[PDB]
Every structure is written in structure tokens, then in C-alpha cells.
């Protein structure tokens, strides 16, 4: 079965629900029907997405399930355990990324130097 697709960009978590095209979807977090009830400003249910803004590790975390309208959530045998740390302007950076960026910086610097040298030697 196709899994969920968590997207954490800043303090917003976007959850997509596959395997349910056409019919509208409904989310449920710890047996609590959430989504497009238009009662909270953070939680928002799109056509297939779930935008949790200002995510919390203890208040807004745990089990998540998605079901079409008219299907019981107990039938859905595919749950998602979302236990994620979120923070403002938190990017997932490693040693390889900074190594690549410094290598490309050195490369652009050397290229500009060679270009200006070839331009100054002739003219």
C-alpha cells in the first residue's frame, strides 16, 4: 500500500492521504475527528492535504488515520505515527551539503579568476 507523505517545511506539517481518489477524505488524530471543521485556524483540510500549523510534539502528535466520507475509521487498517520535532527556520543540513556548497563556491571563484585572467591577458 502507498504510504503517507509527510512534508515539514518550517512550523507546518502537511499530510497527504493516498489510495482515496475522487471522494473527499477525513482525518482523525487519536480518535478525534479533525480537519476542515473550520473551528481552528491552524488545522486545515485541503482536497487531499492536512496542514497542521504551529506543530507540537506533545499536544498535536500521535496517531493519524484517513478515511473517505461514509467509511468507518475502524475499517482503515493503515495508521501513521507522527512524532516529529518542529522548530522555526529549522533546515535539515548535514556535512555533505555544506561540503558541496563550499566546493561549488571554490569552483565559481576559480572560474571567475580564470575568466578575468584570460580577459586581462588579451586586452
Amino acid at each position, epitope marked *: 500500500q502507498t504510504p503517507y507523505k509527510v512534508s515539514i517545511s518550517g512550523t507546518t506539517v502537511i499530510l497527504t492521504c493516498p489510495q482515496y481518489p*475522487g*471522494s*473527499e477524505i477525513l482525518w482523525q488524530h487519536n480518535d478525534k*475527528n479533525i480537519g*476542515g*471543521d*473550520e473551528d481552528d485556524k491552524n488545522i486545515g483540510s485541503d482536497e487531499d492535504h492536512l496542514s497542521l500549523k504551529e506543530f507540537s510534539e506533545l499536544e498535536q502528535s500521535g496517531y493519524y488515520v484517513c478515511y*473517505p*466520507r*461514509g*467509511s*468507518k475509521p475502524e*475499517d482503515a487498517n493503515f495508521y501513521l505515527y507522527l512524532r516529529a520535532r518542529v522548530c522555526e527556520n529549522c533546515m535539515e543540513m548535514d556535512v555533505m551539503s555544506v561540503a558541496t556548497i563550499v566546493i561549488v563556491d571554490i569552483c565559481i571563484t576559480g572560474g571567475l579568476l580564470l575568466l578575468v585572467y584570460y580577459w586581462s591577458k588579451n586586452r
Partner: antibody
Amino acid sequence: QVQLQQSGAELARPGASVKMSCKASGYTFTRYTMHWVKQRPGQGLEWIGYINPSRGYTNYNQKFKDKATLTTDKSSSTAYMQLSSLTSEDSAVYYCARYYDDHYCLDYWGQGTTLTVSS
Amino acid sequence: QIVLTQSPAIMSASPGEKVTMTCSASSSVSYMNWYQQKSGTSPKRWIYDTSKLASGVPAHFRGSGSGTSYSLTISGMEAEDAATYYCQQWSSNPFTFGSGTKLEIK
């Protein structure tokens, strides 16, 4: 609790445009959906489509697609269904119903409107 | 597009027997509901979630079933049970109804 009011006998012509309504009052209309059912004299029930009063998500089937359009209004907390390109088999009764999520059924209905079309 | 046909369409019997109406589905549905409608009136919720009864329904009705076949049993028929019953499911995408069975007293 939920009482839904529907119009009476509406008169049309083959190929004209009709627009019937379902009047809801006495509950949080924006929190529950509204389904529409068609019943011809001598046959059973057929689901037309439903609409969510929150953002207007509509759903119909392939038999009633391109025929009926569902709208919802919060200023009166009502639903409207407009039909066009009518024929003989269109003359039937139309009911509106409220859907209960915790019960998975249509708990409350309307008295229905009798649509009579002829030349 | 699960087609809900009701094989026992016609029903006519004396009050007090065991009435058993079946509803067959093309695919395995999660539940089944039963609506009751009399002549010239609006249908109403009779049985929801395939095991629970609504407010006002007497206690002698009993719906059950699973898989692709559900049923409704009238534990003692009366003189007012003469109506048309429809089986409905929304586990799939369309809100498919039942062909409907006709129950009449003798």
C-alpha cells in the same frame, strides 16, 4: 430536532430549467452535509448527490452528472438543486436529507417536491 | 459502484410470523442501513450501522449480517409493518441504495 422544509408542486417544460430548494433550520447547518434523493412513481430511490455546507464540496454519480447542480447558502442555511434539459423520466419526487457522521445514515428528511413536466 | 440488489422483493404474510429480508452486495461493504417508507410519505431512518435502532423504532426489529450479505428480521410481524424497506451503504464512493422490498399484510 431537524425539520427540513421543501417547496410544493413545480411546473416546467421539456428542456427548461428548474431550481428547487431545501430549507434547513434548528441545528448547525455548516457542520452536517446534505444529500439529495430522487424517487420516480413506481420505482425505488436513487442518490443524486451531496454537498458540504463548509466549502461547497459536491459529489454526484455518473447517471446524474451534467444534469443537476447543487449549491448551498449560509445566509438562510439552505440547499438548492437546479435541473435542466428535462424529459419524461425526470418527473419524480425529490427529497433532501441530513447525514449523521456518528450514525452513518440519513437521520432526517424532507417532505419532498413533486416535479411534473409535460408539453 | 457497488450494486445493492434485494433478491426478496415481494413479501406478503400474516401478522406474527418471522420475516427475513436479505440484501446482497457486489463487494464487501463495511456496514448497511435500512430505511422504511410507506405509501405517499417520506422515508425515515430505521436501522443504522446495521445493528442499532433509531429513536421510536420498537425493540422487535433486528438487523444483522456481514461480508456481502445483510438481513433484517421482524421478530413478530404486526399490522403496521406494511411498508417498503431499502438497504443503503456508503462504504464505497457512491451512496448506493437498495432495490427495495414490498411487505404487505395478509
